[PDB]
């Protein structure tokens, strides 16, 4: 998910601009749901995942808000001490404590039901047990007990009219989620929201802790600790699931890192290119980031240094020349199937070979597979989510930065060989692989473009529509599942707030019994592909002026 919030000192023809692209994957019917709520203290418009009561993306005529997933480390695993003498008990603070348990029965269409037990300790549900070591692993979430409070925080924040009111609700949202604020006066703000544990001294949050009592969390850290900024001196707030703040630690997932190589830099380059950005320029950051190869900026300098003494006829140099002439923006040819430039395929093959030679070779099997991905992994339906720089590539980037990297290279990933030799060897592999598939004339290489699919199965892999409801888009775009933009105090209008979004395929998923799809079943699908957007209405007058239908209900609770 990405977000850019442009404040008063960076906005052109407005006081603030918020552009959000939450990345949930692509589904039919739409992942998010458009809704306006007016009354009972609310006056809001926007769209939200699974029609939650709280709108994740929207505004109330005074402030606007949005989110990107935070990926802070809010989950630790406690290794519980079991005993074969006391089945169902664990040792905690010097006593054998009974675990909580429940039985569940899975009913099965056209099959036999299955019954199993779920077990829980003071540190959470049990994920797995090792009877050999008499250890059960319990998953502890800092937000445990605060699920409903977090849903409500997301609802009540919609009534906030200033930063103080909004942060009071941010402090109640317990999941690890980046929240963003903008308002009619041009203020902008950011909170890395959530509950985070106050860990004992010595607790390495990347690895399990004993569950016998000494390593239990002290409690939760205070809201003062959550990373936050209000009206940053830069004049903007940008995020693409990168680190909130210097010295803040990421999720403990082994394939997740915050390092020198980060896709958020592609947003910074576009926001810093010109002194100020209009709303149209802020919106156009979607299109450019959508099409940007994320590895070119990272590795092009290494490739150029490695090839700088080679002859004009050397294919390893010619592959780099091809990359040098490119800005990394992918564009479809007229076939709607191939990219105009072959650079992503060059980087994919090169990076795949480099990782095999470096990070992969340093890591014992079967852990090595964890580092072999190039970041160009997909499906025949195209990527299931965003594209990112792979974990292996981020580790390789540190190694190729040499003493510019702050990470100690405890093992030389080049195994004593000069980096240039390895870089050139991977370029020889690249030339062999690609020239065998396309021939020797790089100018005619028509490499396959990625596509995008609105899948009929939800993110869990569960049908939420019939298979034929799947929708296809030729151009994969590394962008929000929806995109929404809010403009504050525009000089081009007297309104305090203007806003737009796109919810594809459409607002409705309804198909009647006879197969007739609703009128709003697919009317945002072309707008999505073309980087278009529709106006979001807030006021009664604007709603009425754009009314298609109405219903009046009369109901007693």
């Amino acid at each position: 998910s990405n977000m850019w919030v442009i404040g008063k000192s960076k906005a052109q023809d407005a006081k603030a601009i918020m552009v959000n692209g939450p990345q949930f994957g692509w589904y039919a019917p739409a992942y998010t749901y458009g809704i306006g709520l007016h009354g009972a203290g609310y006056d809001v418009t926007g769209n939200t995942p699974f029609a939650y009561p709280g709108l994740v993306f929207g505004h109330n005529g005074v402030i606007s808000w949005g989110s990107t997933a935070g990926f802070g480390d809010d989950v630790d695993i406690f290794a519980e001490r079991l005993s074969a003498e006391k089945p169902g008990y664990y040792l905690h603070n010097g006593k054998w404590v009974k675990m909580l348990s429940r039985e569940e029965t899975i009913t099965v269409k056209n099959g036999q039901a299955e019954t199993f037990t779920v077990w829980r300790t003071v540190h959470g549900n049990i994920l797995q047990t090792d009877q050999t070591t008499q250890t059960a692993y319990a998953k502890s979430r800092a937000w445990d007990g605060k699920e409903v409070a977090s849903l409500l925080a997301w609802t009540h924040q919609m009534k906030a009219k200033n930063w103080q009111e909004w942060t009071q609700q941010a402090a109640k949202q317990a999941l690890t989620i980046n929240w963003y604020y903008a308002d009619v006066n041009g203020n902008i703000g950011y909170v890395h929201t959530g509950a985070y544990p106050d860990r004992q001294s010595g607790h390495d949050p990347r690895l399990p802790v004993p569950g016998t009592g000494k390593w239990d969390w002290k409690g939760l850290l205070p809201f003062e600790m959550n990373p936050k900024v209000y009206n940053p001196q830069s004049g903007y707030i940008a995020n693409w699931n990168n680190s909130p703040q210097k010295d803040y630690p990421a999720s403990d997932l082994f394939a997740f890192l915050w390092g020198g190589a980060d896709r958020v830099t592609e947003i910074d380059r576009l926001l810093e290119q010109k002194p100020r950005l209009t709303a149209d320029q802020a919106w156009d950051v979607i299109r450019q980031t959508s099409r940007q190869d994320l590895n070119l900026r990272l590795f092009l300098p290494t490739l150029q240094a490695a090839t700088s003494g080679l002859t004009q006829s050397d294919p390893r140099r010619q592959l780099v020349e091809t990359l040098t002439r490119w800005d990394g923006i992918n564009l479809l040819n007229d076939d709607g199937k191939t990219w105009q430039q072959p650079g992503s395929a060059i980087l994919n093959v090169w990076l795949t070979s480099m990782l095999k030679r470096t990070v992969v070779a340093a890591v014992p099997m079967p852990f090595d597979k964890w580092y072999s991905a190039s970041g160009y992994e997909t499906t025949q339906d195209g990527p299931t989510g965003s594209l990112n720089i792979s974990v292996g590539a981020k580790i390789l980037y540190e190694a190729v930065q040499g003493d510019k990297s702050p990470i100690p290279q405890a093992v030389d990933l080049f195994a004593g060989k000069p980096q240039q030799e390895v870089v050139l060897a991977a370029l020889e592999d690249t030339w062999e692989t690609l020239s065998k598939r396309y021939g020797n004339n790089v100018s005619n290489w028509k490499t396959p473009a990625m596509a995008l699919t609105f899948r009929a199965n939800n993110f869990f892999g569960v049908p939420q529509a019939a298979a034929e409801e799947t929708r296809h888009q030729a151009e994969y775009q590394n962008r929000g599942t929806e995109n929404d933009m809010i403009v504050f105090s525009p000089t081009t209008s007297d309104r305090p707030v203007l806003a737009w979004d796109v919810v594809a395929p459409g607002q409705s998923g309804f198909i009647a019994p006879d197969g007739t799809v609703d009128k709003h079943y697919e009317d945002q699908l072309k707008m999505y592909e073309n980087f278009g957007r529709k106006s979001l209405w807030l006021t009664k007058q604007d709603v009425e002026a754009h009314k298609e239908s109405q219903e009046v209900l009369h109901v007693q609770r």
Binding site: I106, K109, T155, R206, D252, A410, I511
Partner: protein, 208 residues
Amino acid sequence: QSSSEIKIVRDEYGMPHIYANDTWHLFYGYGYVVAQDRLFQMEMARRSTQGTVAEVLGKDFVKFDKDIRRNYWPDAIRAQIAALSPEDMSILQGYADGMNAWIDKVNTNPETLLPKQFNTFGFTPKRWEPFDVAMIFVGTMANRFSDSTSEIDNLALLTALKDKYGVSQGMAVFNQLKWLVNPSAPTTIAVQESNYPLKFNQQNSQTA
């Protein structure tokens, strides 16, 4: 205006706007329009978030259902709902009650109102309660975007690195591949503004 009245206006893209005079009525209108636009999607989201997919789709979803149920404690969610004030409860209750109003219409005239997908997949929709609404959020936001850990796998990687490199070098190579923090990471908040003031153990001292 009356407290019983709910006005629903859809725009030119079908987006609904709810007008009501109290919390329950407002969320009732929201639930009602959700049930008109997205009933099948929401029913299947319910089943996904509670692990009741195999009931309608069969044996291929058994392991899925078990994994969902093993990852939450439903009675704890219900205790959180029981502790809500009347105003907060009204949000969840209104939402459920509005979906049910439409669901009941659907099930009374299924020949014109039942989404085709129910006929395709062979079942009919049942009513909702506040717990179901809460679990849509928990299962699709909390569990998707806030329940991420690989610590058991990390410890296996660390064990394998120590076997290959020795205790000290294995810990240092874990720090190279899975660093705690990396000061050159681009940060949403610039360093001039603030930095995080806590330092963390980076050598598995919990078992030293």
